[PDB]
Amino acid sequence: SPQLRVHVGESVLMGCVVQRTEEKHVDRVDWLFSKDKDDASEYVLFYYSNLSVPTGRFQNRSHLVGDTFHNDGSLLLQDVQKADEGIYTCEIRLKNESMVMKKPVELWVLPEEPRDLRVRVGDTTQMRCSIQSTEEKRVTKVNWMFSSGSHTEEETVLSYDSNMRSGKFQSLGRFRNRVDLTGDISRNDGSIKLQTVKESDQGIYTCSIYVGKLESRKTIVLHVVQD
Ligand SMILES: *[C@@H]1O[C@H](CO[C@@H]2O[C@@H](C)[C@@H](O)[C@@H](O)[C@@H]2O)[C@@H](O)[C@H](O)[C@H]1NC(C)=O
Ligand SMILES: *[C@@H]1O[C@H](CO)[C@@H](O)[C@H](O)[C@H]1NC(C)=O
Ligand SMILES: *[C@@H]1O[C@H](CO)[C@@H](O)[C@H](O)[C@H]1NC(C)=O
């Protein structure tokens, strides 16, 4: 059973894909949460008759992102909190099948990442953004934006869209020639590298990382210091 660790605030995609040679529709998916067994459980989401229903304290953070016409009942849980630590069980039945697959996934939650990233002038840094996932190729779009304290508007640092022939755009303004993707988008990683950091690079970097139309958002405050 997969054991996934995430920091507080992160998203996690828990795969629930039924291995078949044929592309079958999903009839039923249930995702249930228990802290230990705990003697207690709660629904994250259920799906029947072509409708998903995120429930309870997961109602606004949870999404069936699997292709329900291709054997897939995978879940995206956003904004993970410490109370989300425990076991997620997927029960899934495909159209025209009687058998039910049951797949437990354990989620471990580490303390939230610091908001601030400290860098010295002239150094290189990474800004990391990725979704924790058992499944490849789920991220469809990554967009990095920048604002300083004095900006009237965000500017684009780097953008990648998997559903365009275009693919990858890099800044032609303040970050020109100093930014590139270090993440493998096919492995759900939108991380970038920023080279020869300047004082004027100080500010808020935002990553919007998409699984379909569903955005997960990450903020990094770049604090540029001396010596
Ligand atoms: C839907 O499924 C039918 C096959 O069911 C299979 O055989 C039975 C005896 C069970 O043991 C089970 O494990 C199998 O799934 C097909 O014969 C039928 O054509 C299918 N329905 C249609 C026409 O779409
Ligand atoms: C679910 O949607 C599919 C694809 O449009 C359709 O073929 C099927 O009949 C639907 N199932 C039910 C029972 O609503
Ligand atoms: C629930 O609230 C979140 C957090 O603000 C928001 O992004 C989302 O639109 C809501 N959920 C859905 C899918 O309606």
Ligand code: NA
């Ligand atoms: Na269905």
